[PDB]
């Protein structure tokens, strides 16, 4: 039985080695965060508008000014190859078939260049800064290979304390490789090419990356730039003031700070304050979750684990199936609440509980 | 032990094939809706008025201006024949013996005409519009056979995603038939009698039926007209403005949209705004649930699953028993809260929790 | 292990026949009421006052102007003889040894006269009116035998729907008798002594007893009169206006109306509005429950099941033990919150949660 | 697996005799208090500040004007020797190695003098007053041996009703001794040295110790003085008015009054009202709990059971490990919420839930 996202999670758990499933499903510390990410959606219920002609419905919507099939994206997730062979490509091709963007992780198992050469969809690149020079190299590589949008993830200044991984002594699968860091030379002896080599031999990001550094990144990247990992309207607003074209409210799927608020708690405020695109992720599993966020003003919702369950359970086809179910889910929900055009969603369709 | 509605649910589950019980009991998606429908009643508790003479109590009340034994009705439910042989007739006869109306579903297993010929009680007809022409035929048939009231159900523009049915591959019992669509001719070749035949060969309602279409229905039906499936005081008010004589607040027993609010959440507001009869259903199981709704202003409460448990467990007699228990329940509750005349109920007997 | 009331409940359940334990412990319908009666106490927590000299503490307090050892009473409960032989006397003697009043039920197994002859403590009489003439007889009997206070119970206009009793086909123990109705003659033929005989052959109270009837009772009884079963400050106030010397807020231990509010919900309001003694019962098990009610203004707390567990488990000694534990509990609590004199309790020691 | 405090609790439960584990883990009566102490932390979630340079973080902070490695302390707990041999010394040495103070209990198994001679860290002394003369002796002894701070615990005027201890008939381990009361002479015959001997032969504190007595203690002790066990901003303020240099909000880890509020409920108010150091304990297990309290204004958090689990499970090394984990936990949390300097914490990093 594969009728919803949970069904794929169940199948994924049956097919993945425990260590890998825990890497995927686990959250930080007590996992109160991942639970809160799910529970917060119950803070809203629907107030359908009846007797509305919903015979013709549209899920098409502009994201950052560019039209796509539906307000969804497959968000950046690292080590996809540990879930399914060539996982990054499977996800990218499924997203492309569905008419939505795919975001490649800095910690992907397929390189920026290789993906761009094997997929003609709308590819976005998610950046993690470990070393400024190396980051610049990846950004320029993404630019030259056709990536349309750059996403800076800011919520992993230090690694999250995921206790399942500690219990399992989780180690990156030996057959896997952080492809984007491949060929970053060596032998070079001197400050950089030493301070860099040392940085790469460390599983820690550049914790000093601040607003000033964002300005640097803004000048380097000429296209759309989003800042991911924000949990306040104030930070979202500052990002816009610093040059960002939009933001992605997110708590990294409860994988970094267990007691972090859910981004849903500051969605409406961020939308009202910034006046710019506010995308969101963390906890989305049902079409109703997605519609609630869109009704509150979100430009689009990025999927993390939802599509990864499809990938881990049935590869590319599994991802296609999850996207198909979610699209039919969103469509069904729109019809049921009396909002035929997804772009017409508003808070008026919701009741705060 | 058959002392309340739950006892009949338990017996019904023991006597019905799993597939059928799931069709009856199931809700949309995660079934958070059916649970919420039950839980919402705990938002109110009673503040009895003591030392009131309750030696003489009355449950008699006018519904749409017409007096009936108690403010209850057996609401429209499809495929009753799958629960018990000639289920529609059993329910109708039980309702008639209890002195309350029975609402026949468009998806009933006994035709509009056959029921009217075999039951002299107050029969109401619930309409689903798949094809305008066919709907008109049913409405006129109900009119000519003595049905007093017409109920338009508006919350199934598209089919609900009930996962139990998907797991069981639920298929309408072969010995059952949507009798009201019987004899709708064929062979006829041309636009209609083709666009119609195609519509009937589709398990989907007319999703375009809107306010304009309601105006059409209002002109076709000369007697009392109610719109069912509303979940907002605004929609209820618009229905009255468009000609309706009252409304039925309802989320279809949590079978259509899992995250829909419970109609109890907008009952008081709808009563205050419309100033017209506001009936309600969804989640009612105990007399206290019913009394709470009546105290908040509801004109009457329609029973869905409650009487179906009686039907599935013990046929017509089972329905008689459930109605008898509920009547004694309501009566007992009125005595206990110090409101001898059911028509005297008000919010003053309740405490918001 | 017998260190609190719950320990006695556990022992009582082990020693009583299931039917009897269910009669004792059971509540109306779903028993959400008895649960709410317990849960409501968690709506308040303590804010102790430190560095207060609590070396000398006093639990002595006036109830209706008369001093007693502590602000507790053993409330009226019927069929005590079904829990332990001569249960009414055991409870009365334990209450007397503890220095608190005992309230005899109209449905006691020991007569008004017999108890008064075998116990010299402060005896109160709880009245149920089935027949006016018979009620007058009992009231006069209580008056002539030394009962100091009369309590009219108003919350059983009709019998509660206790489903455990229905499942067990509960029948008053054959070796038991409603002693207070003994010798009410017969053979007499005519209106009364016929309308009366019929009333006694019915397990139903006089549902017509109203405010006018209370006035009649007020004129018949010359001493302190309390009205029990109130659940609103308005009713409590009316009782005072009609002549009552105080009231007992109560939902009959969740045995009559499952969805009734807990009396704790209207305690403070009743105290402020009436300006007269407001006693309370329903749900009290821990000394902290009792102290919370007293802090909110209650004159005294009546125990129902708490002391009955002591009785059912270990007879008179069991009741003595429960009262001893509760007294030590209240004393300990007073010391811990910094209120050495129980009469000094106020809302300032509480925090609303 | 020893990755957090709970892991040490699990190991401690496996290594300690049941009686001892219950003495350690148990709470008063129903233990709703210890549960509330944990649950209250979920009333706040984090709103991280992104793009803040957190490459250089500092946990150093002044407590009562004196700098220490982090805003933590190992609080006073009695009978540590029952958990691990020379438990008091193990805890003291671990605290000293971590750069934080250790508070010796009046009911310690190692004397004030012996500890001071074997540990050169910052030692605090917690006082319980059973007899004024004896208390003075201990205070002077602590003064002469180098203890920097005196803590008066005021929440054990009477002993808490811990039912686990009652069930286990808990008796202070025979190989243990209340060392601080050793050599308090005898044979002396007359008022004191009789009223004193009797006081020592009683497991009850001086319940008369009030504000006047605090003034006496204030004049006796020349250094920093804190009052522990407060649960209101009003009491905290009075302590400052009476001469205290700060307070410790605490409910004694839910071991004294089950229905006591959690000190977290009055932390912000106490900080705002007193304008003096407000330390706190009760319920702290995760670094996030600690950071929430510090963000609300707490000067420091005292650990009770957290470090005792380390002690009971693995002795001194276990305590070292727990402190190491908590420090890394706090550090990680600071980085994640964007507050590199622990002294910069404020309510702005929190969201009330
Ligand atoms: C297995 C896994 C790996 C992840 N790796 C990254 C990453 O490399 N880059 C990034 O920006 N976010 C990363 N994320 C976070 C996601 O982008 C997204 O915020 C999160 O999955 C949203 O929550 P959800 O899983 O409930 O949908 C990861 C999430 C998961 C589940
Ligand atoms: C088995 C089943 C079939 C139903 N079929 C119909 C239908 O044909 N027409 C309609 O208007 N409502 C239909 N309903 C909805 C009911 O009219 C009513 O809204 C719902 O049962 C109320 O909730 P309750 O079941 O908790 O009482 C159906 C409900 C059930 C349980
Ligand atoms: C077994 C049982 C019999 C009772 N019988 C009577 C009665 O005869 N008269 C009356 O006034 N209340 C009666 N009560 C109600 C009590 O006076 C009291 O309101 C109730 O027990 C308080 O709640 P508690 O049981 O939680 O303490 C009865 C309660 C129990 C538990
Ligand atoms: C086993 C045990 C013994 C204790 N003994 C004392 C004591 O002698 N003096 C004192 O001031 N507090 C005493 N306390 C209370 C602690 O100082 C502290 O308030 C409490 O442990 C904080 O809660 P926590 O255990 O959740 O951290 C004790 C606590 C425990 C767990």
PDB file of C-alpha atoms in Angstrom, chain B residues 1 3-4 7 286, chain C residues 9 13 18-31 34 160-171 255 305 309:
ATOM      1  CA  UNK B   1     -24.633  -4.797  26.588  1.00  0.00           C
ATOM      2  CA  UNK B   3     -26.688   0.920  26.595  1.00  0.00           C
ATOM      3  CA  UNK B   4     -25.303   3.623  24.302  1.00  0.00           C
ATOM      4  CA  UNK B   7     -22.115  -0.350  22.271  1.00  0.00           C
ATOM      5  CA  UNK B 286     -24.026  11.216  23.120  1.00  0.00           C
TER       6      UNK B 286
ATOM      7  CA  UNK C   9      -8.632   2.555  46.824  1.00  0.00           C
ATOM      8  CA  UNK C  13     -10.825  -2.904  44.994  1.00  0.00           C
ATOM      9  CA  UNK C  18     -16.641  -6.194  41.511  1.00  0.00           C
ATOM     10  CA  UNK C  19     -20.298  -5.110  41.423  1.00  0.00           C
ATOM     11  CA  UNK C  20     -19.881  -3.172  44.660  1.00  0.00           C
ATOM     12  CA  UNK C  21     -16.543  -1.630  43.728  1.00  0.00           C
ATOM     13  CA  UNK C  22     -18.083  -0.454  40.450  1.00  0.00           C
ATOM     14  CA  UNK C  23     -21.065   1.018  42.307  1.00  0.00           C
ATOM     15  CA  UNK C  24     -18.586   2.942  44.452  1.00  0.00           C
ATOM     16  CA  UNK C  25     -16.012   3.993  41.864  1.00  0.00           C
ATOM     17  CA  UNK C  26     -18.184   4.404  38.793  1.00  0.00           C
ATOM     18  CA  UNK C  27     -19.279   7.640  37.221  1.00  0.00           C
ATOM     19  CA  UNK C  28     -21.893   8.694  34.691  1.00  0.00           C
ATOM     20  CA  UNK C  29     -21.596   7.610  31.055  1.00  0.00           C
ATOM     21  CA  UNK C  30     -18.021   7.958  29.724  1.00  0.00           C
ATOM     22  CA  UNK C  31     -16.590   8.912  33.113  1.00  0.00           C
ATOM     23  CA  UNK C  34     -14.699  11.884  37.351  1.00  0.00           C
ATOM     24  CA  UNK C 160     -27.619   9.300  36.697  1.00  0.00           C
ATOM     25  CA  UNK C 161     -26.787   6.991  33.808  1.00  0.00           C
ATOM     26  CA  UNK C 162     -23.998   4.930  35.376  1.00  0.00           C
ATOM     27  CA  UNK C 163     -23.128   2.300  32.818  1.00  0.00           C
ATOM     28  CA  UNK C 164     -21.025   0.093  35.100  1.00  0.00           C
ATOM     29  CA  UNK C 165     -24.177  -0.554  37.135  1.00  0.00           C
ATOM     30  CA  UNK C 166     -26.084  -1.328  33.935  1.00  0.00           C
ATOM     31  CA  UNK C 167     -23.417  -3.809  32.826  1.00  0.00           C
ATOM     32  CA  UNK C 168     -23.414  -5.472  36.249  1.00  0.00           C
ATOM     33  CA  UNK C 169     -27.195  -5.318  36.634  1.00  0.00           C
ATOM     34  CA  UNK C 170     -26.414  -3.745  40.005  1.00  0.00           C
ATOM     35  CA  UNK C 171     -29.026  -4.560  42.626  1.00  0.00           C
ATOM     36  CA  UNK C 255     -21.966  10.239  39.227  1.00  0.00           C
ATOM     37  CA  UNK C 305     -14.968   8.256  48.024  1.00  0.00           C
ATOM     38  CA  UNK C 309     -12.002   3.534  50.406  1.00  0.00           C
TER      39      UNK C 309
END
